[PDB]
């Protein structure tokens, strides 16, 4: 029953966590796209890299 509860909940937990990874990766790509044109520093781009990691 422990294994059944964990198999029931980890699919939802990892769906939520992969949506977090995808949203943080889109935030990194937008911080990169603000960096490439020049309006944003490189240290904020590194902050976005570390939140992604």
């Amino acid at each position: 029953a422990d294994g059944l509860a964990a198999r029931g909940t980890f699919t939802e937990q990892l769906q939520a966590q992969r949506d977090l990874v995808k949203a943080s990766d889109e935030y990194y790509q937008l911080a990169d796209k603000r960096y490439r044109t020049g309006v944003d520093n490189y240290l904020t781009l590194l902050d976005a890299q570390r939140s992604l990691f």
């Binding site: 020049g38 309006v39 944003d40 520093n41 490189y42 240290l43």
Partner: protein, 52 residues
């Protein structure tokens, strides 16, 4: 090596040039106090003396 933005460099360079033009426009007045002769020729008499 891009430790500051290109846009922040453009704004600071604009502040540099926009204060350099203020130094130019405030140096025009110091060139006006020493009253330069506008044209070459023979000058008459001074209408106002010193002190006026």
């Amino acid at each position: 090596d891009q430790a500051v933005s290109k846009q922040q460099y453009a704004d600071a360079n604009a502040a540099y040039l926009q204060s350099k033009a203020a130094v130019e426009q405030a140096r025009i007045n110091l060139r006006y106090t020493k009253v330069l002769s506008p044209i070459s020729g023979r000058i008459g008499r001074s209408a106002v003396t010193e002190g006026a």
